[PDB]
């Protein structure tokens, strides 16, 4: 019999037997000994070969893989039955993994997770509280601009609180930039309309959008219905208009100037006294000498038809206003330009639109 | 020949034949000794080796294995046949459920359910009847934020009574929550519009969502037609608006405060005297606060569109009020503030949108 280089434990093993291959990633270097119960849990004893023990470091991490996949997808059909003991009894993969061997592995021994994910799910911990799992699952990806930040471990329900708990990690390398006071997270779903649709990815692996925030480690969020998806306004001018009424308006709703989109609206909040909507936007960096001291700001939400008696001409357009609520901007002409606005800036939605905006060209120099 | 250790009883013999291994769980424990029927139903002897015979207990489920792992994911369509030495041999599993053994797996002998799932399927059972079954189907899962509750179990057609009795079964952990007097369900339907697409996993893998609700155990309730998804507004201030008409409004349509989402519309009743339809409505717990005893609702459903003599201005906006009806807020100004609304509340619908609304500006400190 074999010595046992490494000894494993689960609960549930997953469909490993005595002779399953133990491959490093693609690549068999072992074999599987023996699998005997204790209390609860179950002993799986490795035979890794001689000449392959180097593989085997402090910080590896075992998962099963079962039997032989037909996985089909872009990639054609890629079977994966390579070695004959895989496709006969499962096997067993593992790999060294940087930042592991943290919090997890250190008193009894390695664990055999179920599948690779889970074996991945390495970092620092936080906590997601959500109103509803119905758009969660075990092992959904955290993404920052397409990249996956982490992901999704557990899914309990809390009847108390009712609410879910879904416990989720950050990779080692982003757990310092993200897990602070004002990040936000939340399910992106798929957009189909008659309008036009997106995140069509999202019908198959839907994944938790982050927008990154300053303050100080939390570690314990809250899910939010939307956020912004890109960082093209993320550092930029922040300002605050205020409004008897939000409205059409919305996250991530367009900030217009000269009709262009410069900004977008990030939160609209209900004021100390509830009395007024306190909108924040990003006003790009780009774009962000346009703010100006006087800068009149105005709804420019759907379509607002003309009216006249003996003759009035109607105007239509094709705005995304009418599918999302822009807001536009104008500075009122002077020679001593007003100063720049600074970040604590609170505006006042002008439910007028000026009318002699356009006739304004207000100069504004970078 | 093995002696029989416990026998069983199945129909539509699952693909189980003499020689096929019995795992406790994942770990083969023993195997099966002969597949007869008896009058109708298959018995099916086991014999588990004796150092495992503690393993087999009285709250003990068994359910046969086999079949393929199709997973459509983000990665393509992914079949896996993680066992081959014991796929083409047959393998019945089994484990310890906490809450089984009721009152079916006792008196004569344990059942091999044709699955994992239907195993699991233990605890308090209720009995759900339903106007048309066409939505409901037997193990479909019975969600709770998400989490899977329950699950439904039979679908009967009593004729003399024209609707359809389908015994459901809510997990023991559950069933003090739920099985209440206020608890409704209702299937979840894919709904795919020119206005947007939502629910689209309920495609191939529909389910039936749950509200709790405080009152007498019940054990017996009715299929609804539609469900607040979300426990975001369970917890808070509960009250009653009157009209003379509903019309637009229906269950889940938002209840509004300067144009945020504040509340929900959570019933329609008619009333004792049936002349005024009971908008029955649910103010979070964050904003309770600005529903005071003066405060006027008013019907902003759909658009409603101007009209002026010498100049007058369309608005046509972007509102889901279009799609699902909204009520909206307002507090007239006062120094003396009118103290926060009871549960019990009745106010009225005044469909005049006070027209110097805007301009309130009431102060409502938290």
């Given at each position: 019999?074999?010595?046992?280089?490494?000894?494993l434990?689960?609960?549930?093993?997953?469909?490993?037997?005595?002779?399953?291959?133990?491959?490093?990633?693609?690549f068999?270097?072992?074999?599987?000994?023996?699998?005997?119960?204790?209390?609860?849990?179950?002993?799986?004893?490795?035979?890794?070969?001689?000449?392959?023990?180097?593989?085997?470091?402090?910080?590896?991490?075992?998962?099963?893989?079962?039997?032989?996949?037909?996985?089909?997808?872009?990639?054609?059909?890629?079977?994966?039955?390579?070695?004959?003991?895989?496709?006969?009894?499962?096997?067993?993969?593992?790999?060294?993994?940087?930042?592991?061997?943290?919090?997890?592995?250190?008193?009894?021994?390695?664990?055999?997770?179920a599948?690779?994910?889970?074996?991945?799910?390495?970092?620092g911990?936080?906590?997601?509280?959500?109103?509803?799992?119905?758009?969660?699952?075990?092992?959904?990806?955290?993404?920052?601009?397409?990249?996956?930040?982490?992901?999704?471990?557990?899914?309990?329900?809390?009847?108390a609180?009712?609410?879910?708990?879904?416990?989720?990690?950050?990779?080692?390398?982003?757990?310092?930039?993200?897990?602070?006071?004002?990040?936000?997270?939340?399910?992106?779903?798929?957009?189909?309309?008659?309008?036009?649709?997106?995140?069509?990815?999202?019908?198959?692996?839907?994944?938790?959008?982050?927008?990154?925030?300053?303050?100080?480690?939390?570690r314990?969020?809250?899910?939010?219905?939307?956020?912004?998806?890109?960082?093209?306004?993320?550092?930029?001018?922040?300002?605050?208009?205020?409004?008897?009424?939000?409205?059409?308006?919305?996250?991530?709703?367009?900030?217009?100037?000269?009709?262009?989109?410069?900004?977008?609206?990030?939160?609209?909040?209900?004021?100390?006294?509830?009395?007024?909507?306190?909108?924040?936007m990003?006003?790009?960096?780009?774009?962000?000498?346009?703010?100006?001291?006087?800068?009149?700001?105005?709804?420019?939400?759907?379509?607002?038809?003309?009216?006249?008696?003996?003759?009035?001409?109607?105007?239509?357009?094709?705005?995304?206003?009418?599918?999302?609520?822009?807001?536009?901007?104008?500075?009122?002409?002077?020679?001593?330009?007003?100063?720049?606005?600074?970040?604590?800036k609170?505006?006042?939605?002008?439910?007028?639109?000026?009318?002699?905006?356009?006739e304004?060209?207000?100069?504004?120099?970078?």
């Amino acid at each position: 019999l074999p010595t046992t280089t490494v000894s494993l434990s689960a609960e549930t093993l997953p469909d490993v037997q005595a002779g399953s291959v133990v491959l490093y990633r693609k690549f068999e270097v072992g074999e599987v000994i023996t699998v005997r119960p204790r209390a609860n849990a179950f002993d799986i004893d490795l035979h890794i070969k001689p000449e392959y023990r180097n593989l085997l470091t402090s910080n590896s991490v075992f998962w099963a893989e079962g039997g032989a996949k037909v996985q089909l997808n872009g990639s054609g059909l890629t079977v994966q039955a390579s070695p004959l003991s895989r496709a006969l009894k499962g096997a067993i993969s593992f790999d060294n993994l940087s930042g592991a061997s943290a919090s997890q592995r250190k008193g009894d021994k390695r664990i055999l997770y179920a599948s690779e994910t889970a074996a991945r799910a390495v970092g620092g911990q936080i906590t997601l509280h959500a109103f509803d799992a119905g758009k969660l699952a075990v092992g959904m990806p955290i993404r920052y601009l397409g990249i996956d930040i982490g992901q999704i471990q557990t899914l309990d329900l809390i009847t108390a609180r009712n609410e879910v708990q879904a416990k989720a990690v950050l990779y080692p390398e982003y757990v310092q930039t993200f897990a602070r006071g004002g990040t936000r997270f939340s399910v992106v779903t798929p957009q189909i309309s008659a309008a036009g649709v997106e995140h069509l990815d999202t019908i198959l692996q839907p994944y938790i959008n982050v927008e990154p925030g300053r303050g100080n480690p939390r570690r314990d969020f809250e899910l939010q219905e939307a956020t912004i998806t890109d960082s093209r306004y993320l550092d930029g001018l922040s300002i605050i208009v205020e409004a008897p009424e939000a409205g059409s308006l919305g996250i991530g709703t367009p900030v217009l100037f000269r009709g262009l989109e410069v900004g977008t609206v990030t939160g609209m909040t209900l004021g100390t006294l509830s009395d007024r909507v306190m909108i924040a936007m990003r006003i790009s960096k780009r774009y962000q000498h346009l703010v100006r001291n006087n800068s009149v700001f105005w709804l420019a939400s759907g379509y607002s038809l003309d009216f006249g008696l003996t003759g009035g001409v109607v105007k239509t357009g094709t705005f995304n206003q009418f599918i999302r609520g822009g807001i536009a901007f104008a500075t009122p002409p002077g020679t001593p330009l007003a100063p720049k606005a600074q970040e604590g800036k609170h505006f006042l939605l002008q439910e007028s639109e000026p009318k002699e905006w356009r006739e304004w060209g207000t100069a504004l120099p970078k």
